[PDB]
Design a binder for this molecule. Structure first.
Ligand SMILES: [Zn+2]
Lengths: 73, 30, 76
């Protein structure tokens, strides 16, 4: 399935993911595509920060869902 | 970070990092 | 019980619902009133997004409650 990741400024990338993918895997994919290290990635969905150990399915993240990427420094 | 904030358009409780509503893109009011 | 829906125009309509009603049933009523298909509707109440499959009572939705209708963004 395809999900969207949007920066705080509204710029959007698209990812090919699986419901079983962990947030760690999604951050690794984002690092592969855009070069942003996972320790500097914070992902928000439904108002909450997502934890690396859970999967997209654990947060009810479905196809066409949008995650929000925040730079952590 | 701060606490969550209610959208002034739809009331959704948004993360403190977001500058627009996650549901309707209404900008944060503060 | 009667609840209110803040529609896309800033207008508030009234619905007769039961605490046992599903979120889908409310979206179908909103579709009859406002012409927005349920799959493009998001319903927000007191900061909470309402999920399909749940009942109004699952969200402590009472008489005089106001839900906010949101057009479901295109994603991104
Ligand atoms: Zn909103």
């Amino acid at each position: 399935m395809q999900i969207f990741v949007k920066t705080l400024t509204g710029k959007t990338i698209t990812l090919e993911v699986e419901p079983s993918d962990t947030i760690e895997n999604v951050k690794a994919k984002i690092q592969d595509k855009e070069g942003i290290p996972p320790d500097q990635q914070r992902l928000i969905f439904a108002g909450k920060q997502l934890e690396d150990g859970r999967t997209l399915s654990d947060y009810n993240i479905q196809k066409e869902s949008t995650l929000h990427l925040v730079l952590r420094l | 970070e701060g606490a969550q904030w209610n959208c002034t358009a739809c009331t959704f409780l948004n993360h403190p990092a977001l500058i627009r509503c996650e549901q309707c893109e209404m900008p944060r009011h503060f």
